[PDB]
RNA sequence: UGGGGCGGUCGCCUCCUAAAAGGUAACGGAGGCGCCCAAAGGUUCCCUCAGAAUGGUUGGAAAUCAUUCGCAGAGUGUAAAGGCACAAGGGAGCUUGACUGCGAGACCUACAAGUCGAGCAGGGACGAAAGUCGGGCUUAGUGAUCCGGUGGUUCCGCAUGGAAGGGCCAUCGCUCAACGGAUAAAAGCUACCCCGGGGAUAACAGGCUUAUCUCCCCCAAGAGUCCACAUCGACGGGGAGGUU
RNA sequence: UGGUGGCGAUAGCGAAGAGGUCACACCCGUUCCCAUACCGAACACGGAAGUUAAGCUCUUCAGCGCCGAUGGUAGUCGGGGGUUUCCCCCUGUGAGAGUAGGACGCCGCCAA
């Protein structure tokens, strides 16, 4: 069940852990988009950084 | 009221003290005796699981004696338990004072069990 | 006054957890005996903990409340 | 303690600050140690309280036997204790605080420099099977290098044989206490002094703070024959303003 | 019915009632043996006079004690909002405490 994750806010001014999580998710520029397969690990990652991310289930 | 204190309680505390360092848990088991007014017991304890591989008391028939304990019957049952713990006796065993000074029946059955490997 | 009049620290606590150790590996550093040697390890002169065997470290309860042997390689 | 002087202070242990791993500063709070002695410390056995707590010649009225009860007061302390209840708290044997070494590991991450408790193996020991001989939870200090002494030397010794001299292994001796220890060395006086740099002491000059300091309310005991509030004002409260 | 064990008292600690028959022991002692530190009190040693009268097995009892929820709550995690001394809002978490209760144990081995 692929789902799309979009970076909606810049990372400038954020603590290091949130930046590392966002970078590990694959996002590198604002307004980027990427697809991943839905499981508990991805949901936890989204939960950590959710104010900088918009999730949509295609 | 002077009251009265149990005899067995001191025996249990003494047994605990002697059992702290004692193991007789693996292979070579522990042999404990139970001196009593009737007679004295003798049995094997192998820990980790807990079974009596071999045992021989005095009130188990197969020849007896008037005293059935005390001093001379201590040896008279000592050699008997020794052969019992020989035909089925494997390796050696560690003697448990049990809570009674060696001097006496303990020392007696011991030397008999010394022949039975200790 | 009290000025400084203090001492140096002794970095004393735990040093291994849930992992595989070797022979002798130090496991804890205590001043009294909050931890007792439950399985095949020893205690040094100044209340240290041993291994005596290369195995896997456990931390269990002493069975008696308010006490934790909490040592069991392999 | 500097506008400026007017002082303690350095090395080591234990506790708070320290934010439930570990580490964490300030002239931030509290206490100490430069040792021991000696009872020691091995071992095998034996234990049981302790503050109170039944009765009590006479002290201890009660070393007094007997009631009753917590693993309890005690555990060289030097030092609080901080952790430790056999936390090894109370009595009985010939050893004592040996000689070779050493696997790891913890620190350090500075390899540093120094530390720390290590199983295990070999020679020979006490007490008893098992310990332990590698003293008694963590301060004494192992302050190095460097000097001198005291012993051993399978070592070298200027052509040869010696010797004088040195090496190597154990050892005993500095408040080197500003304790990682300039060289055995060391008061001042100089608005008579001189050179190089520094942003400040100058003196808010301006800057911050408003402790203060000024000024004003809120409350009202009372006073005032009388009567709170004609004139006041205890008592508290809460503010302004920029002079000091 | 002893010996020998295991788990946090839900084991405890009591209270009551039963038996003592075994047993376990009291208990007669003290020949011998250990004594005793000092002192048949233990300590051994000797049997068994009398035993259960204890003790040994029960049987109950939460009287104590023990164990212990749900449920909130304090606190806190990440995002916010304001008079930003402090407060609020959302997101998770979640104590102590009390309490409903449970609970008078079980589990062995070798005897018998």
What stretch of H or E contains A5?
A: strand A2-7
Measured CA to CA in angstroms, residue C20 lies from C48, C51, C53 at distances of 18, 10, 10
Nearest nucleotide, C1' to the C-alpha of B72?
E46
Measured CA to CA in angstroms, residue A8 lies from A27, A37, B1, C42, C72 at distances of 11, 20, 89, 58, 51
Which range of residues forms the domain containing residue A13? 1-58
Chain D: bases < 7 Å from a protein Cβ: 8-10, 12-16, 21-24, 26-32, 45-47, 66-68, 82-85, 87-88, 103-108, 116-119, 129-130, 135-138
Which range of residues forms the domain containing residue C72? 11-74
E7 C1' to A47 CA distance, Å: 44
CA-CA distance, B30 to C35, in Å (whole number)? 29
Judged by DSSP in three states, C15 sits in: coil
Contact indicator for C27, C50 with CB cutoff of 8 Å: yes
E5 C1' to A16 CA distance, Å: 58
CA-CA distance, C72 to A13, in Å (whole number)? 47
D184 C1' to C8 CA distance, Å: 36
In this complex, the residue with its CA at the shortest distance from the C1' of nucleotide E32 is B71
CA-CA distance, C22 to C51, in Å (whole number)? 7
Nearest nucleotide, C1' to the C-alpha of B108?
E33
Our count of domains for chain C comes to 1
A42: CATH? 3.30.1390.20
Nearest nucleotide, C1' to the C-alpha of C62?
E8
CA-CA distance, B33 to B55, in Å (whole number)? 10
What are the boundaries of each domain within chain B? 21-118
Which segments of B27-89 are extended strands (E)? 30-32, 43-45
D27 C1' to C33 CA distance, Å: 39
CA-CA distance, B69 to A35, in Å (whole number)? 88
Neighbours of chain C (3+ CB pairs under 8 A): none
Examine residue C1 and state whether it is found in any structural domain, yes or no: no
Our count of domains for chain A comes to 1
Matching CATH number, B21-118, of 2.60.40.10, 3.30.420.100, 3.10.310.30, 3.40.50.1950: 3.30.420.100
Query: Method used for this model?
Result: cryo-EM
CA-CA distance, C24 to A45, in Å (whole number)? 41
Enter the tokens of residue C33: 């005996």
CA-CA distance, C42 to C36, in Å (whole number)? 9
Residue B69 CA, chain-centre distance (Å), reads 13
Examine residue C23 and state whether it is found in any structural domain, yes or no: yes
């Amino acid at each position: 069940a692929k789902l799309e994750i979009t970076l909606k806010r810049s990372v400038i001014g954020r603590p290091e852990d949130q930046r590392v999580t966002v970078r590990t998710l694959g996002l590198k520029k604002t307004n980027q988009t990427v697809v991943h397969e839905d499981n508990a690990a991805i949901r936890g990652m989204i939960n950590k950084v959710s104010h900088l991310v918009s999730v949509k289930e295609q | 009221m002077i009251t009265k204190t149990s005899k067995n309680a001191a025996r249990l505390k003494r047994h605990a003290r002697v059992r702290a360092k004692l193991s007789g848990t693996a292979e070579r088991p522990r042999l404990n005796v139970f001196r009593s007014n009737k007679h004295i017991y003798a049995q094997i304890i192998d820990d980790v699981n807990g079974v009596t591989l071999a045992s021989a008391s005095t009130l188990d028939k197969d020849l007896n004696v008037e005293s059935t304990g005390d001093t001379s019957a201590a040896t008279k049952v000592g050699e008997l338990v020794a052969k019992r713990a020989a035909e089925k006796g494997i390796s050696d065993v560690v003697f448990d004072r049990g809570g009674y000074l060696y001097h006496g029946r303990v020392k007696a059955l011991a030397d008999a069990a010394r022949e039975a490997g200790l | 006054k009290n000025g400084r009049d203090s001492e140096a620290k002794r970095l004393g606590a735990k040093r291994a957890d849930g992992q595989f150790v070797t022979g002798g590996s130090i496991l804890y550093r205590q001043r009294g005996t909050k931890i007792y040697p439950g399985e095949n390890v020893g205690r040094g002169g100044d209340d240290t903990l041993f291994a005596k065997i290369d195995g896997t470290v456990k931390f269990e309860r002493f069975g008696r409340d308010r006490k934790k042997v909490s040592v069991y390689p392999v």
